[PDB]
Specification:
The chain has 102 residues and is mainly beta. The protein has one helix spanning 49-57; strands spanning 2-5, 14-15, 18-21, 26-31, 40-41, 72-76, 81-86, 96-101. Bound molecules: copper (II) ion. InterPro entries: BlueCu_1, BlueCu_1_BS, Copper_blue_Plastocyanin, Cupredoxin, Plastocyanin.
């Protein structure tokens, strides 16, 4: 699967903001435009340790941004379920998405 992170206009959005993948299918997040963004998964309180580890590995560091230098990030989630992710800098601005794993 591919997800666009941002746009050329400067909106704080993922495109699309909902996507469905097969277990183990990578999601490639690639920056569009000049505004830096990242992607980090929410870790539900409640999630098993294995799922928490998967989600952390599928997350950028919050000291890390995609740029024209480093344009993309690839995440792989194995556990079937629905997950929410956000952009660290624009989290308050509601820059978020959902991932469904079949
Ligand atoms: Cu952002």
């Amino acid at each position: 699967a591919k997800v666009e992170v941002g746009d050329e206009v400067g909106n704080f959005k993922f495109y699309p903001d909902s996507i469905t993948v097969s277990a183990g299918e990578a999601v490639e997040f690639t920056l569009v435009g000049e505004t830096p963004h990242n992607i980090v998964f929410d870790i539900p309180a409640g999630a098993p340790g294995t799922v928490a580890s998967e989600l952390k590995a599928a997350s950028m560091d919050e000291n890390d941004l995609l740029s024209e230098d480093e344009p993309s990030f690839k995440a792989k989630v194995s556990t079937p379920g629905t997950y929410t992710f956000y952009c660290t800098p624009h989290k308050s601005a509601n820059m978020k998405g959902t991932l469904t794993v079949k």
